[PDB]
């Protein structure tokens, strides 16, 4: 019967970038907008509702107000392309497209959002010039929680104080700042490494204590 097909069942998008996911549907002649219906949703939230050749924005979710849109140009070629700007963690999940055009079908697209600790801000402060004690600070945002490893150019393991808090700018993002107090000489190099946790669910086994054998 009428079948909607999807080129990529999975998209991996960088946090803060723009993504465009596509759903294909059969077109053998001129696109008849009056009989065409296009529906985009994610976690029971309406994203795009295209009916009678026009986009119905009344039912659209607040989260996608002025950042989501359907590419009209691609529709004539039989391509339902959803473009979302400024992708956040909340945009990570399972999307669903529905197409009605002389028949009806729907497909599923998994979207993954990666928020790395790749925007690292640093600061260097002299605490005491007499003892040449310095204070080094690294900060970055991402998900999930990250620990900071301080190493010298000798790659010796150093211990600093790390503070992890929620990001004020965007929800569900962790702001990670670490501070190291150390006496050092000029032009020596230090490294702050942000080790992140698995962005996938952890695995757990349940253990139940049995009766004591004879």
């Amino acid at each position: 019967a009428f079948t909607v097909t999807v080129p990529k069942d999975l998209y991996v998008v960088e946090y803060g970038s723009n993504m465009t996911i596509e759903c294909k549907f059969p077109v053998e002649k001129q696109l008849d907008l009056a009989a065409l219906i296009v529906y985009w949703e994610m976690e029971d939230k309406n994203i795009i509702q295209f009916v009678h050749g026009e986009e119905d924005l009344k039912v659209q979710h607040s989260s996608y107000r002025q950042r989501a849109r359907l590419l009209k140009d691609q529709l004539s070629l039989g391509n339902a392309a959803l473009q979302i700007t400024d992708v956040k963690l909340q945009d990570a999940g399972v999307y669903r497209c529905m197409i009605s055009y002389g028949g009806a079908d729907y497909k599923r697209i998994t979207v993954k959002v990666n928020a790395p600790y790749n925007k690292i801000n640093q600061r260097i402060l002299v605490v005491d010039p007499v003892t040449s004690e310095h204070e080094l600070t690294c900060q970055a945002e991402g998900y999930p929680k990250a620990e900071v490893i301080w190493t010298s150019s000798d790659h010796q393991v150093l211990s600093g104080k790390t503070t992890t808090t929620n990001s004020k700018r965007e929800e569900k993002l962790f702001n990670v700042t670490s501070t190291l107090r150390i006496n050092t000489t000029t032009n020596e190099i230090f490294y702050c490494t942000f080790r992140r946790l698995d962005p996938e669910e952890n695995h757990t086994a349940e253990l139940v204590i049995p009766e004591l054998p004879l």
Binding site: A1, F2, T3, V4, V6, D9, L10, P26, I37, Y39, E41, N46, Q49, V51, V59, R96, M98, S100, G102, G103, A104, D105, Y106, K107, R108, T110
Partner: protein, 117 residues
């Protein structure tokens, strides 16, 4: 605005022998004047295969897969004529409401086992 429940895809495990026919049942309560019911095969690697739908257009389907409506209008039979050993796997049915509002609900996965003769 009357809420309705997701479709049921019974049996959860259908076991038939190759050469015979297998039939699923997709049931739900329709409050829609215009609606479609589709049949998907969900295999690993993320590929979703559309087998049949109601109403039937002709659209070119495998013909071994067809979806037919029972007289009561609430139960639908997803049939496979002469099931192959390669027909094993997980299958789902979904419903598309267009008339009252645009909403989509999908049934649970149902495993189909095709045993040798």
């Amino acid at each position: 605005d009357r809420p309705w429940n997701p479709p049921t895809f019974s049996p959860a495990l259908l076991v038939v022998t190759e050469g015979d026919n297998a039939t699923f049942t997709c049931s739900f309560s329709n409050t829609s004047e215009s609606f479609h019911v589709v049949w998907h095969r969900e295999s690993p690697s993320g590929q979703t295969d559309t087998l049949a739908a109601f109403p039937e257009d002709r659209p070119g389907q495998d013909a071994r897969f067809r979806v037919t409506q029972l007289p009561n209008g609430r139960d639908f039979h997803m049939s496979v004529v002469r099931a192959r050993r390669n027909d094993s796997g997980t299958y789902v049915c979904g419903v598309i409401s267009l008339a009252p509002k645009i909403q989509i609900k999908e049934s649970l996965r149902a495993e189909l086992r095709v045993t040798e003769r």
